[PDB]
């Protein structure tokens, strides 16, 4: 692979870096700005609206060989769990590779699909694995580099940096405490995390808000990760508001890259019971999932025991287990908030990719920008004896479905906390396949309403061995849509087994791009359009792009929110 | 970018000249794991015949051409497992365009072997609209002045140097007379007089004595003369084409004839649909005996309709066992009972020592000793294992087996056995069926691990007891974080255990997960030699001369990396950039000292 690569720097890389200059540079763009206005759940009795929770992912394994806008590799870090993230930082940086790290754009452009913002990372390694302080000496040159950072964030398009400084006097110290008020100052409307570690002296680390490090908290950063190493928070606290900030800047460190579930933690000094507080969560190395699993299905597996907990469902978390999951703590979050919302169920890579329900490439792929606003609830359902999954064997758009499978002698599947406004011209529209002949529902819930609303679909298509239905919504214009299921009846069968490969709730051709056949061995260029497809005459898939370009007869089509497909423009 | 050898293919006149002695592949497509002789037969399901035989046409590799002679890094690879209900195995492969004689590879040669199947290679002249060439066949049948045929010579040269069982053969070639239908049938007759003992010889029910291709799908006047011509054995056996609905009159013919019916093999196409193919089950499988045997064409399907192992494996076991997932209870009302239904289960478990790693014969990881060697995903099907008889039985609890692809001992794979059990409660699961002679100093050995610290006792039935005995391990030894036990059966010298299994009691938790990783029942430093592979120049091959598989390991700088397994006589490595180290390991997988080579 010659390829773009996502961007990493040694300091005096970043000090002479343009990206005008950067033949690369382009294709590490986002292009997904953040959604705002987030709206949370409510099934959780015991989650609070206080704390915040961080997460420290190794979205890539590496800091180097990252290729720009994916890869033909199924097993990928595609992290789905969003919902219960606040703010992301992507884990990268070493002394062999470099120490100024921002987020490759499709983990961006995922991030901020889900409306979480994600920080690049500012990497001062210790001196046993290569540290140097001239490289810490070198971004604290004033008079440049802070910069630097903040032009990297905005041409990137990422939410601000985590500072972390493990390099082996008070000089030095001082000199940090005014690079990040100087970031302060520059700054747009962007986060600056700091990690517990570098004190008042010049590496200490306190595992607390205390004395010796509250001054890297006029003030000088947004947040701090506290440090792994404490059985309570409730002094850091009370050290906060004495300061003037909130607890909930105070992201206290868990070190699950080990054991993930298996980790050992005084939760009660974090989250005493019936009490608020103390601050807020940090987790080091969720990715725990990914790395300790060989299969794409363990790995999600992992992951949802790690975010939802043994119970499998968010609504009835165990707070009395070894880990009673990210679930029991915090409400999940919907990006559902805008009309058109639209699904294809996409986790981000596959086995193979889909069109309309036909396999267009058989080969491997992943494509984070491509991942879909998942799932709020993993899983909540109510009758029959169901188990609801990804399935990486069908799709409809993409390499992936929702699998609804098991034993059914009604049950129900609630799936999506939302805020979707309902004006004349909107539908729902789902697509399926049912292996059993069963027939499968919608279900939508009204705010004021507790109940989602179970209904048949009012006009079918089928496509390409899917059943499509449309169900027009125009008797609830002025109404808002505050939850989205499934659901189904048993047949003499006894069984069901659905794939969904479609939700949607709204309504609607983008035209033909102007692509340009460029030089990288080549790059196409062509400045509504969800993402676009570059098809290859044999019709057969090799590309996909969020962005405005990608390096690979050709026929380009951009394909809109609604996933309605242009006239394909033809290329030779 | 793979450019080391390839498993051969060829044209007639390629193959009229090819001599393994010059042919820098050909030592790479040897198999060296022999035939097992004598097969164990289960009873676990009551409506199983010992009758009719089963013929399997598999897609073992989807392609002809581009197959690496020993295995590939590539984890989603066809590891078919359910050789236990098949008696024959058809290497389905060849075409116009790569080559249309084309034998077995050696790993899958291998893995057929190690279960006690034999396994044919293919001669296949393709219908004229996919390229089929009437020359070809034309070719293939010419003859001296002796009577001899000296491509079917080949064939059989072929079959002895590669090592593997036999031919089928499958005209589909339109246009020949009744000249050319003649020559066929003396080329048929010419491999019978000239083939070793326990050869077999199958021929497609397809081109007729006129020399036309019109299949009868059944025995008929058209076709006997291919199977045989009065007190001349013609062919081994016949694969008959697919749109019958009843067979009766097929063996009625055959008995006139004076062969068995079960020579006859009933072709069902699954290739499309798999367990959904319509079958007129009542048409082969009556009432009293079978009419016929059964020939199952592209059960790869399970393989070439999925994208994840996981779901290629259910759906192997979908199709073999049936919808219950219990060889035992079949249902003979279901749309497809399952191969489980008409068929005993057969098992090599006969000899002492027995072995398994459960070893699946691919991975996404490979590990010695429950530690990870090597991070990259793999396939080389003579490192498959003799896996469970049964698929799936199990008394009491509430747990599901499956192979995992996760945890694993040696190789990439363990039996996964999970879900919840009360406390107090017993659960066993049956694996085996074996027949294997209990001597002194003869062990019983397991390794596992325990997610919930359940202990697993060991289950082991003697003939002719029913009961299963089960019992706990006597001595411990903690490896990597595996537990194995060590049960000696010198109580028991004498008997011959004729089945294996494993128990467990459920505990506070409630919930058990096992990964079983080794169970078994019972060398020197490899010479090696480091040569020129001449097709590659920056490749290279080893060559050696007890031993279950070898293993070659690399020096790094994170401690020894695995780049090789072998189950023959050498590998080819690319870019060999060094120093290496090759272990022979044994049936019992004890390790020789590592050859160092640099
Ligand atoms: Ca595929
Ligand atoms: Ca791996």
Known sequence: YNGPLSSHWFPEELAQWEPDSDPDAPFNRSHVPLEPGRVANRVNANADKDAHLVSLSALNRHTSGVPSQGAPVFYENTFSYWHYTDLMVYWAGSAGEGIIVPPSADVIDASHRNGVPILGNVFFPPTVYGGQLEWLEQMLEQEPLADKLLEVADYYGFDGWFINQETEDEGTAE???????????????????????????????????????????????????????????????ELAQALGRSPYDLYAGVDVEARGTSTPVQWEGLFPEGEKAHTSLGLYRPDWAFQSSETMEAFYEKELQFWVGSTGNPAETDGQSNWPGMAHWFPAKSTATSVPFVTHFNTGSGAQFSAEGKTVSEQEWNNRSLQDVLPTWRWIQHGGDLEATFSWEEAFEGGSSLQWHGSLAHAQIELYQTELPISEGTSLTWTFKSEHDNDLNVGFRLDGEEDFRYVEGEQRESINGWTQWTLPLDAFAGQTITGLAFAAEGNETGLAEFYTGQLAVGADKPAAPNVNVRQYGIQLVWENVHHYRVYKETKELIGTSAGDRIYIRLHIEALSETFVPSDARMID
């Not at 008020?181 to 570098?198: A, G, R």
């Open 175 to 237: 000199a940090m405490q005014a690079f990040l008020v100087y970031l302060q100052e520059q700054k747009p409307e962007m986060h600056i995390m700091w990690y517990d570690s570098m004190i008042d002296t010049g590496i200490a680390w306190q595992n607390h808000l205390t004395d010796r490090n509250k001054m890297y908290l006029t003030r000088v950063a947004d947040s701090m990760f506290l440090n792994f190493w404490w059985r309570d928070q409730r002094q850091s606290n």
